Symmetry: D2
Subunit: 307 residues, 4 copies
């Protein structure tokens, strides 16, 4: 059938929530791929029964065979070891997966999750051969969900009604752009002026946003639900030609003064993949922060090449 | 049952789409009220069958009896004649409906649609006795849907990703605030700077927005689908405690320099009705336009009182 | 874009609700076609604004040009005059539309609504040249929505949890199969045995079901909301490859003893159109009723050919 | 706010999917309760960010404090050790939780998951003091999702279009009622007669259904996604007054010849909790199987009382 085929390369915790959400949303058939024997088949079987509760009709299958990438419309990569020593190990995984994408599904739209995402997405771009508009990395949708959510709780408004931009890279050098925050489309500064939220409060929210993964890990949990939902928002925009503006890691070709590297910026996602790369008109102080993010991606990319 | 009861006072074209959408969304039981015999019962019966297709369970009943307002959680008023000569006639309808609200459902949340809305909502406020946080008028959600949509089509982005503010009043004096337009939370001016949309294009879109009802009437149609969807977005925010920021007509108590009048401004809608009135920090030129909108509402309110 | 294109041939009341529902469900781009000037453009414009409220991205355009059928994935025909004298007039409309389908969109999936549907669907099948699996008529989903709904109200259960079969033809000779009614998958007879609903009650519900269109017309309304929702359930099953079992008019090739005629029977609708025709194992008494339905379709088909 | 408060007593794998699904569906505020320190707060924080992606507004909080049951509208119990030796241990947990329900939320609707469910639900009923219509156990929705799904895959129909009844108890003595299976509301026997599925195939599907939890465990996974979706279907029916017919464990008062015990049977779930208990008109052979299921529940209930 013309139902979409979505292959999850990596069947860990994020993969499991993704399969669940795909079925809830009836988005397409799902392959849970992993090199681990049996497990993806088990998760696939459990998930498949939810078609009944959800009134959906998506096949959910497990796989240890890379050739099941054939016919994929979307491929979502979470596979990888989870420190700089892991970089060359995860490069080798991106190499392996990229060769299989080129062979089996060169026209697939690819979303990379493996950290550090801004590095790993470019490695997979290089090894898979796919066009620049057909591969992105997770970052900004996830990072801004935290910022938007925390502000919405202070202001007692619907979370989605807060909008915000975090750019450059996923990770500790993410650039939180105070000037680009709105509430119901209104500049956040109006709310600061009105003493509904203070500058000091926002500073604390910014730090919390940057450190959220660490906060969750120290609570004896770890982030997989919100990462999964962010990825599925991205995949859905592609599959349904929604043309949502979503911040993702993408190949820069001069934007922000940078080329020959991936970084986080708003893009438009629809049926042609990355339909538009939107370059924020950053001031010099914001650009300097963007530059630090890119420098760190470059540092790690260099370590990834050889053991 | 604790299912919400939603009474549509007026069972014309907007009422018919509202009942349809309530069932699609399983939002509550529906009464289609009208003074017209038989017709509301017919529309109610037709609509009721869609529970099957929608997997919903909402009762849909017709009514010619005002006492069926008893137990209403939400009351949506579209009743009215459709020029200044109609003002005193529609005031008498608001009086009649207000007396029935006070008697039967004083705790209901009230949405007024009857034009001119900014006048009629205040008349109903006065005659119904309901608290200021429990009655609003349709305006800005509908008017901004046009502006957002037209810009989204030029920019090839998801319509909801354009945000915009139109304030003061529904109608020909609506205030379109160019400074408060964003695309993916980014100021529209960045897109103008980048020559993705021009100032001249936006001027044409502004005029189209103001004249949209007329454009549709001259096409041998008339607006009822988008008005209905806007109203249901508002009602839904209340019923589900979404706390969405939505522009509606509400009692001003000093905002923008105005008191003892209703006008269009962003508000937050949740379980307590109007939870917050948001006052945009308008500059003097924008305030002058706001003042013209209010002056027109006042002119018409004065004509409404006596035949 | 690979977004589906859905052309509504006929932009009357059913067409207007269909366009609304397509946007709510983000199912595809919509053309409201009619021979009436201006009106489809007006309805299209009104409807298009609801993309904002619905978080959808479907184009909604009006058209007086048949060549806009090009590229259609789904075509829904409601055009027609609304008595036997109309039969040859509506045949000529089916001829005209069929020629345009063959030319512009021979691979489209076609849903016919024009009454009498079981006749008009076959005429369009003949004139369009499309495969037997790619054209169906509205009937059973709509007629059974009434029966299911009325029983659900008596039994105080979710409407969708009542299932029921009405076959043969849409219209006054529809065959209501008492033996094929279930409630939560349980035979209705168990509920009769338990005195939760009586045989006399069901007889009254059967008559009400057959006469529902007339009941609504006499209430100074007419059925368009539930017909629209039924059609969109069918179209959605096709577009999303849901493989729902839905009763529709389809070409019979021996089922029930009948060939070379369309009639109402459960079918499975997915990406290949009619994937399966399900033949109920009717007893002789039920078959006799089926035969009467077919005889009436044949009588009218013969009158349709010439003025 | 009148937003529902849903307390998940137990924040393990099923609890985590439940919180995710509640947010996706905007069903209410969520407390993830556990005796484990920190972890529920971590899962709560991760999940809370999905309000943004989902356009929802549900609070998600963690808790180690039983008094946070106050104000709960729905309480879902998954807490428990996971063999007969565990029975007295899990009884003590039900005792503890029941005392806290009686004190803090005596009017809450309670769903029990802890295995063996048909025993543990009755123990919690006894210790909590809640009315018989306000507490149910998970079983039949989950078990029948497997049966429905497996048949739908053989017949190439939408999974939800297969209906089926499994009664008596959750667990290895579940009663699979071949006579009560339908496909699009049609008796499955018609499909057997037509050689679309054989008796031997159905026997294999029956065994697979009974052993599904074991099949998933042996695949180096374990069932939590489909159990969570089943529970949320039940909770949703209550919260939204859907009046769905759903098979759950409930207090029997003579049905099937049994009293003073809980067992699996179709019930109707709406705003008043268990609105109707539906007693299938089982034949003597089916009743004998039902009796074996009840006997096993009784055996285990007796072991639960003392260490
Ligand atoms: C740690 O290894 C993985 O998790 C993994 C997962 C996938 Cl989905 C593919 C390949 C993977 N690994 C390798 O190819 C490898 O070189 O170890
Ligand atoms: C033109 O009259 C109406 O449409 C109408 C509608 C409702 Cl729903 C109530 C009262 C109404 N009218 C009056 O009370 C009236 O004074 O005419
Ligand atoms: C009564 O005429 C119609 O409503 C109509 C509608 C469409 Cl959509 C096509 C053709 C139509 N008519 C004709 O072709 C005609 O022969 O009159
Ligand atoms: C194994 O213990 C649990 O998992 C547990 C969970 C909850 Cl949510 C409450 C009480 C619990 N336990 C006890 O009260 C206990 O007696 O151990």
């Amino acid at each position: 059938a013309p139902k979409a085929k979505i292959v999850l390369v990596g069947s860990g915790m994020i993969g499991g929530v993704m399969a669940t959400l795909i079925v809830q949303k009836n988005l397409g058939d799902v392959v849970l791929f992993d090199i681990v024997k049996n497990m993806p088949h088990g998760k696939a079987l459990d998930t498949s029964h939810t078609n009944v509760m959800a009134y959906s009709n998506c096949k959910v299958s497990g796989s240890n065979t890379y050739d099941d990438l054939a016919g994929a419309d979307v491929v979502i990569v979470t596979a990888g070891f989870t420190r700089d020593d892991l970089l060359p190990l995860n490069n080798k995984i991106m190499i392996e997966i990229g060769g299989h994408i080129k062979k089996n599904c060169p026209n697939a739209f690819i979303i990379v999750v493996t950290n550090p995402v801004d590095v790993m997405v470019q490695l997979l771009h290089q090894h898979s051969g796919v066009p620049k508009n057909k591969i992105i990395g997770l970052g900004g949708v996830l990072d801004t969900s935290r910022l938007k959510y925390y502000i919405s709780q202070k202001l007692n408004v619907c979370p989605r009604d807060v909008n915000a931009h975090i750019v450059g890279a996923h990770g500790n050098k993410m650039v939180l752009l105070k000037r680009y925050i709105t509430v119901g489309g209104i500049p956040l500064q109006e709310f600061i002026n009105n003493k509904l939220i203070s500058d000091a409060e926002l500073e604390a929210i910014f730090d919390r946003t940057v450190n959220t993964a660490l906060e969750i890990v120290n609570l004896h949990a770890s982030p997989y639900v919100a990462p999964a939902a962010a990825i599925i928002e991205m995949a859905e925009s592609y599959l349904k030609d929604l043309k949502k503006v979503l911040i993702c890691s993408t190949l820069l070709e001069g934007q922000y003064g940078h080329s020959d590297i991936f970084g986080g910026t708003p893009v438009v996602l629809g049926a042609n993949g990355v339909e538009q790369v939107i370059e924020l008109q950053l001031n010099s102080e914001e650009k300097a922060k963007f530059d630090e993010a890119i420098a760190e991606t470059k540092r790690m990319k260099a370590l990834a090449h050889a053991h």
